[PDB]
Symmetry: C4
Subunit: 387 residues, 4 copies
């Protein structure tokens, strides 16, 4: 086994080829499939896995009742091979968690699972499934992390955590982790910024994270840093606003866009110089639809012009969280780090008249060969028999 180098650049890509679809909710109508939310994908040098937060219950069973609820002692982080439904019969147990991150350094899996009370939550770090560290809430207000993969470079893995209000100034910390041990952390000096649920990826030995401002930004905040945790911060400038909810596209800002800025959804974007690939919902007001947009000056420019749009999920279909994942040269044999992404397709409450909330997933990888837009939605027929 060898550490992932993480020193090559992100592969430029012209479109997105479909990689996986699990059909979890459709299958769970009969099969034994976990009620889940907050899924994400992460790869080792050998395989790619879907991680997810269970609700300690199965679809179409009474224990799925009330699963709109975000945090409980029953939620667990588990994983299964990409594209398979999350079932008790094919899933690896990772951690007890209502917020999580995970990533592979080339040698072993790092998992981070946060559980405990809202006023004193504890992140448990594991390396190869053995507890290696913990970090406890420092603001006593829902310690929370990425809900997507952490990022690794040369044996060090990096993540971001938040503690404090979701509707005002909070506290954001970056962590450097080696063999599951926190070896350095820094608090970001980001007055007037808000960071939640960062999607972080490696690119030329440094980490870029695109996150969710739940306080007052309808564009997405970003933070980038080197292995020594020297960081920079900003917001994506494009008038192609990335959050949900958001206003109709118009002139943007390199600071937080206040219009429709409260609340949000976990998302991601890939930076290429001044340009950016933005993944976003199609609806400006609800978690519906998904599309990928290439905006060649969208990282630093405020106009609402863009060059490419690719459909992923139709506007009349449910979407949800989305996040980046990468495939390193050690896995692919390429000379660059390949960008991929996943989308959570949320079914049930609050929009649908069920007793439960759960998601399925789709994923795509970037390529420079021909691609096509379409809609690959969840496809389940609600309500279910338990409803």
């Amino acid at each position: 086994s060898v550490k992932l180098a993480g020193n090559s650049s992100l592969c430029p890509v012209s479109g997105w080829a479909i990689y996986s679809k699990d059909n979890s909710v459709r299958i769970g109508s009969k099969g034994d499939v976990f009620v889940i939310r907050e899924p994400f994908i992460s790869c080792s040098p050998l395989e790619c896995r879907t991680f997810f937060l269970t609700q300690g219950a199965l679809l179409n069973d009474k224990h799925s009742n009330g699963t709109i609820k975000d945090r409980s002692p029953y939620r667990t982080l588990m994983s299964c091979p990409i594209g398979e439904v999350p079932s008790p019969y094919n899933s690896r147990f990772e951690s007890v968690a209502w917020s999580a991150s995970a990533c592979h350094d080339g040698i072993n899996w790092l998992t981070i699972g946060i559980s405990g009370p809202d006023n004193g939550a504890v992140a448990v770090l594991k390396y190869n499934g053995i507890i290696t560290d913990t970090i406890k809430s420092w603001r006593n207000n829902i310690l929370r992390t990425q809900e997507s993969e952490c990022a690794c470079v040369n044996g060090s893995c990096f993540t971001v955590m938040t503690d404090g209000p979701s509707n005002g100034q909070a506290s954001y910390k970056i962590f450097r982790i080696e063999k599951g041990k926190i070896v350095k952390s820094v608090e970001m000096n980001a007055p007037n910024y808000h960071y939640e649920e960062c999607s972080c990826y490696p690119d030329s030995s440094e980490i870029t994270c695109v996150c969710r401002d739940n306080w007052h930004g309808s564009n997405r905040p970003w933070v980038s840093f080197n292995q020594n945790l020297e960081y920079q911060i900003g917001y994506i400038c494009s008038g192609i606003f990335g959050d949900n909810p958001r206003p109709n596209d118009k002139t943007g800002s390199c600071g937080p866009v206040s219009s429709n800025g409260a609340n949000g959804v976990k998302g991601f974007s890939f930076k290429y110089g001044n340009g950016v690939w933005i993944g976003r919902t199609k609806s400006i007001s609800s978690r519906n639809g998904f599309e990928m947009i290439w905006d060649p000056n969208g990282w630093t420019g405020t106009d609402n012009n863009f060059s490419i749009k690719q459909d992923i999920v139709g506007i009349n279909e449910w979407s949800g969280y989305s996040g980046s994942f990468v495939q390193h040269p050690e896995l692919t044999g390429l000379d660059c780090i390949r960008p991929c992404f996943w989308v959570e397709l949320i079914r049930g409450r609050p929009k649908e008249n069920t007793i439960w909330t759960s998601g399925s997933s789709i994923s795509f990888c970037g390529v420079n060969s021909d691609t096509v837009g379409w809609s690959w939605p969840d496809g389940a027929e609600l309500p279910f028999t338990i409803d």
Copy 2:
């Protein structure tokens, strides 16, 4: 790991010994078994797997409703060990796909999965589960491929794809693929021919494909080619017509037989000089029954005489698609490439009064020791509880 040589000749065989039976539909009456169609078998140097197109739903569940439908965003290519039922608990995810092929070059699996809209479908190629190439519809009319294994020789794998009408002249291309990458393709110059759903196998370093003419042939078209994609084309001459539907046996043609020529079913045949092993339905009008026929001059001769017939499925039982698969010397230790075949046993719509359509499978391998004809049908009792 070593590349399959693919340079020995096809083993001559006198009969077919039963190899597998999954009983998928019988078992799915209670168990958690995927609704599937278009199954096929393919082997590595170590094992044989059943590939199949799911409908993203389980048998005896409401989401099986309407599964007579051929293409949707929910269909996925998955695989499991040969003879096992396709379940979410034992199946490997391969690709999102409503048309597919797969084969192992001795090192890794190649999978090809076509998804997207009818007017712009995209084939996603994976090698060891990593996306390696794509090819997009060139006629904007249901890009489609084998629904059986591709064929590999010395590290190159080969397949055929079609784009265009199913009731008139279409476009047919041959592809050479190395480590999941298309390295060469050619369009077949086949005016008045129609090719779909080719069953292709290697034989002495060259590829032979026997396919389905849905336009105007009740005999089967074939195409054979070397590693440089220099090809020859024709139709099986035998008056023992191979397609379904078809006329009663009589004098055949080395061109497309127009009588009952429209429509068809995926099938296969094995060429041995002027002779041919033909697998076909027993019914001339419907997908019922299956038999293997040895016709010693049937490749090139038009008479309706034959030498051996072996029963596989009784005429009063449902059959469906069939296809070739081979076992290379690297797997068997033999000094020739062994021919095997599978049969899809289709249950449900349109012939039966159910809300769903799904198949089970049987397979056989060629031998020169004693064999026997019989009927190994699906055996499920319809309708099901859900109907």
Copy 3:
């Protein structure tokens, strides 16, 4: 990997320690468990597996209807780790079969599966899951084999097959098989003998089989042979009669005991010089109960005295088939071949008012440390919901 030597003697044992219990029928009341019968155990140098003939259906489903029937095209030989329930989710597919045998030579698994019509059945032999030979019915009257493990010595494996009447003189052949290929066979010259369902084990480089006389013997016939298939035949002499049905114990015979001799059950015994360990039902008239009896002169002596009796299943509980299996020094590290045995616990028809018939299993291994008699019965409560 190395061939099993098979040259050490059978370990003498004073009692039987319980090794496994699967509770298949109890579990199948809810879980997805195959309807099975004719289970048996066989070991490699690394693990022990339960083989079984499915009925291509699950317990408590309508397709379990009529499963008292012995032969059909739906029956398949499959296997799972010892002690686990036979489910579609944990079972390896082996062969299509309504009669079977299997054994590991130290390198790979040999499986033998007989399918086809009663008047022309074909045994398909596989080595490492690849078809290596076939043998076809020579009397056109239900070709049939052990329903327990074959026996291996120095890279050669041995089995017995029968063809002909079950109520009169039939034909019995011994086979020597190497890497799945029949390299020698001989027909036993056994006028007035009847052999079915042999339980064969290796002992000092030679094979001993104890079988079922369905024609006219309530004691068990035996055949022993060396690697060159030079054989001897006889019947177990003990007045402790081994078959079911049978008379009450009395003076026995070294030939077939005619009293209650018609019909029978698959069983086994272990020879130790003049002595014998006999496994048998407790009831003389029905497949109820099970016990192990040590009779120190029972192989060659006709008296009805014995020295040890150990209870296995109570007389008021259902039993069924039983068979030997061994654990070689290559697996155990012992300096002798260890005798073990399994018992099939049959539930359903004809004795119970259900639509189905299925079995669970228990197994035991011989030891010289302390043991105890008890009853470890099936434990399912019939009828089931489907009945």
Copy 4:
């Protein structure tokens, strides 16, 4: 593979970080989950597994009826990866057993499973799944063992067994086992002591066991010994009484505390010099709640003062058995033996109006980084459909 050394000291710890939660009962409402009780965790150098005694039945099925019953021929010891629900689809079969222990010596698993009649039970010992020894009841009164992991040092593993009354003086033996073979045993000379269900761990080459006195002690008895089985005995002195039931905390005793001393629950404690980490229920009268208490002089001192309390399960929630497990340096890379523990969360009879009794589990590992108390209860809603 290398033997565990077992020669380093127990890691001192300040708190307990949550390690696993299986949600078995919640999931078994729909999924195929074993009815179980007496679960425990044990690790190899590579992984940690949950062992458990099934009732040979699944949750929400009629065969779960009467499972309050402790011993039957249907109970089996099985195991699955830690944190996964115990299902027939993910569980390894270990032994037929209604009382058990297991542990890994660094090379292979030792399992001990006791079955048979109350008046003559037999413990079957397996090493790598092969029977290696047996030991039979010596007092003919429910031979019984730990229901948690045995302890290994330098290739020798150690356990404790009891035979005799649960309401008066019984007999207690210590065993030294090498490669599954009993190489030494001694009977403890413990008049007026009572030992059941010992929780034993290694610490500096010696074994410490903390057990259950069901006769007349509401504090816990202990026994410690070296590899030669030279032992010492006593009771935990702390006025923080460890058993359930028990009196309210007050001045304790270094002998058995008679007040509320009859009956009990399996538990554990970790000795650190004069100090002790005590895990106990929160209720003094019933199996409800769980907490960890650090009492710096509680091993040898009788006062009821303590320094740290950490909540694990709320007082209004069901708990049950608890036990120690360790993680050796060979697994963790640490320079000490890490203490962890599990808690069984018992649902059903006798406290709840169901036909069945079953448990789920949680586990924690000791650390010196920040931790938090909370309640991680079972969470199932009773009764179930079957009730």
